[PDB]
Swiss-Prot record:
Disulfide bonds: C37-C43, C65-C75
Protein modification: O-glycan consists of Gal-GalNAc disaccharide which can be modified with up to two sialic acid residues (done in recombinantly expressed G-CSF from CHO cells).
Quaternary structure annotation from Swiss-Prot or TrEMBL: Monomer.
Gene: CSF3
GO terms of molecular function: cytokine activity; enzyme binding; granulocyte colony-stimulating factor receptor binding; growth factor activity
Alphabetically ordered keywords of this record: Cytokine, Disulfide bond, Glycoprotein, Growth factor, Pharmaceutical, Secreted, Signal
Name of the molecule in the record: Granulocyte colony-stimulating factor
Lineage: Eukaryota, Metazoa, Chordata, Craniata, Vertebrata
InterPro entries noted in UniProt: 4_helix_cytokine-like_core, GCSF/MGF, IL-6/GCSF/MGF, IL6/GCSF/MGF_CS
Length: 175
C-alpha cells in the first residue's frame, strides 16, 4: 500500500550530493572559461567592461534577493529574467560558430537544468516577466568584435554570479 515514509528532516543528504556536483562542475567551467577566455580575447582586468556595459547593456546585479525576505514572486522575476539573460547570452556565444571546445555545451547543459527548475517554479507562478522588447529578439549579440568582447565579459560576470549563487545556496538552512 505505502512503505514507511517518516517526515523528520529526511530530505537533505541528497541536496548535499547535488551541491557537491555543482561545485566540481562549476570549478571545471571556471578554469576552462578563464583559460579559454584569455586564449580567445585576453581576459585582462577592468578595461573592456566599459564598452561591454554600453554595448552589452547593464544586467542583473551579483545577488537576486537583498536579505532573502521580500516578495517571493519578485525574487522569481529577477531570478527568471536574470537566468534568462545568462542562458540567452550563452546561446549567442554557442550560436556564433567558433566552437573551440564542446565543453560550452555541457556547462550550458547544467544551466539548462537550472532554467528548467526555474520554469517549474514558473509553473507554480512565473507569468510576470520584466522584459518587454519589440517582440521576440535578444539571444544574439550580432557576431563581431564588440560582440565577442561582450561574450567573454558576460562569461566572467557569469562565473561571479555563479559563485554568489552557490554562496546563498549554502546559506539556505536557517530554520
Amino acid at each position: 500500500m505505502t512503505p514507511l515514509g517518516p517526515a523528520s528532516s529526511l530530505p537533505q543528504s541528497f541536496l548535499l550530493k547535488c551541491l557537491e556536483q555543482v561545485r566540481k562542475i562549476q570549478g571545471d567551467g571556471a578554469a576552462l572559461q578563464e583559460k579559454l577566455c584569455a586564449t580567445y580575447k585576453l581576459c585582462h582586468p577592468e578595461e573592456l567592461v566599459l564598452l561591454g556595459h554600453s554595448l552589452g547593456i547593464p544586467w542583473a546585479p551579483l545577488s537576486s534577493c537583498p536579505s532573502q525576505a521580500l516578495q517571493l514572486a519578485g525574487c522569481l522575476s529577477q531570478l527568471h529574467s536574470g537566468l534568462f539573460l545568462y542562458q540567452g547570452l550563452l546561446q549567442a556565444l554557442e550560436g556564433i560558430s567558433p566552437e573551440l571546445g564542446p565543453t560550452l555545451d555541457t556547462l550550458q547543459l547544467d544551466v539548462a537544468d537550472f532554467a528548467t527548475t526555474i520554469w517549474q517554479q514558473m509553473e507554480e507562478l512565473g507569468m510576470a516577466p520584466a522584459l518587454q522588447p519589440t517582440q521576440g529578439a535578444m539571444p544574439a549579440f550580432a557576431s563581431a568584435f564588440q560582440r565577442r568582447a561582450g561574450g567573454v565579459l558576460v562569461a566572467s560576470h557569469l562565473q561571479s554570479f555563479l559563485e554568489v549563487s552557490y554562496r546563498v545556496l549554502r546559506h539556505l538552512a536557517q530554520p
